[PDB]
Nucleic acid binder design. Structure first.
Ligand SMILES: Nc1ncnc2c1ncn2[C@@H]1O[C@H](CSCC[C@H](N)C(=O)O)[C@@H](O)[C@H]1O
Length: 327
DNA sequence: TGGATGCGCTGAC
DNA sequence: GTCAGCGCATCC
């Protein structure tokens, strides 16, 4: 994550729904905002959240009476994506994990915050012939909010990962916000190799499979894209090896394959998956952030998370818009 | 709401 | 056909 000199969100309160690791919390607090509520029902996610923020998020949001949620200015929610991801079955709203957005609408209707800041996977934007995004847009509009949505790729914001996500920023109409803008992309000067840990700390992650098939030559020049160098097995998810001179592939939460959830990388002549701390870095988390003691759970958590840097630029712009109140 | 890994249907070229 | 994917199915 980056340093934020001008705290655009100072004095503003926000809630952290579907909190996970608390990526939205890190981003908004870095801008000066204050978290007044968090909700996350996964046991291990609650543990790591508490480990880092000192509080246990409330459980199952579907059983929480929205009237009990503290007043706030910004509602944050990176809601479930299994039902909308290009990697899944795409059952969408028909999926038992795909109707959480309506719980969000339920809370917004009651708490009417100034801003609703949501995140989901890129496929959410085109899912069901664009009908899914349209539903969210119309729902927010009905709730009397403006709707700004755009897909941003983390590689355009200083983080070496091709993580494409749709970000939806909604302003309550009475605020008459007409100058919100998504952050502009800038040149990437950090690559996977810049975030790796010393070899001595990741030897246990080295995988030497006799069915490894190097398909492309390593590159010496850094490039802002994923560069596949080979595969193992049939080359499915988690069976692909990439160059560290390029950027990382999207981290996943339930990913399989031998290089599960992180993908494989060629490092000093060897092939290995990423260490939880390297996943944290590829997600923009500071080294000060404490990872969950279970590596399996940590990979899952980071795979479900958000790139802090991206949310920071967006949060800054949300604040920039709210603070522009000329006479 | 365990940990591990082989696997494909689909979206976007 | 090329490849990627906050995933899925199934094993212990
Ligand atoms: N009914 C429910 N109540 C509370 N949390 C839920 C939920 N259904 C799913 N979740 C949680 O929703 C999260 C979605 S992934 C969001 C991660 C978050 N942005 C962070 O930065 O890491 C998961 O952690 C999941 O456990």
């Amino acid at each position: 994550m980056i340093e934020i000199k001008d705290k655009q969100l100072t004095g503003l309160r926000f809630i952290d729904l579907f909190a996970g690791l608390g990526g939205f919390r890190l981003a908004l607090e870095s801008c000066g905002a204050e978290c007044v509520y968090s909700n996350e029902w996964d046991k291990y996610a609650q543990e790591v959240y508490e480990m880092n923020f000192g509080e246990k998020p409330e459980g199952d949001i579907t059983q929480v009476n929205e009237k009990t949620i503290p007043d706030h200015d910004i509602l944050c929610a990176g809601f479930p994506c299994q039902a909308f991801s290009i990697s899944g079955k795409q059952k969408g709203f028909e999926d038992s994990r795909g109707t959480l957005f309506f719980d969000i609408a339920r809370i917004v209707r009651e708490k009417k915050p100034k801003v609703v800041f949501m995140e989901n996977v890129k496929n959410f934007a085109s899912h069901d012939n664009g009908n899914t995004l349209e539903v969210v847009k119309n729902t927010m509009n009905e709730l009397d909010y403006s709707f700004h949505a755009k897909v941003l790729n983390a590689l355009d914001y200083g983080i070496p990962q091709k993580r494409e996500r749709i970000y939806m920023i909604c302003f309550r109409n009475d605020l008459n916000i007409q100058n919100f803008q998504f952050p502009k992309p800038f040149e990437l000067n950090t690559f996977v190799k810049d975030l790796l840990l010393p070899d001595s700390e990741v030897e246990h992650l080295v995988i030497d499979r006799k069915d490894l098939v190097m398909t492309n030559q390593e590159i010496e020049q850094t490039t802002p894209k994923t560069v596949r160098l080979g595969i193992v097995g049939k080359g499915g998810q988690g069976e692909r090896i990439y160059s560290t001179r390029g950027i990382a592939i999207t981290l996943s939460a339930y990913g399989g394959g031998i290089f599960a959830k992180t993908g494989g990388y060629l490092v000093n002549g060897k092939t290995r998956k990423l260490h939880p701390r390297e996943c944290a870095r590829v997600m923009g988390y500071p080294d000060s952030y404490k990872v969950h003691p279970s590596t399996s759970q940590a990979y899952k958590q980071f795979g479900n998370s958000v790139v802090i840097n991206v949310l920071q630029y967006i949060a800054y712009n949300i604040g920039s818009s709210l603070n522009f109140k000329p006479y």
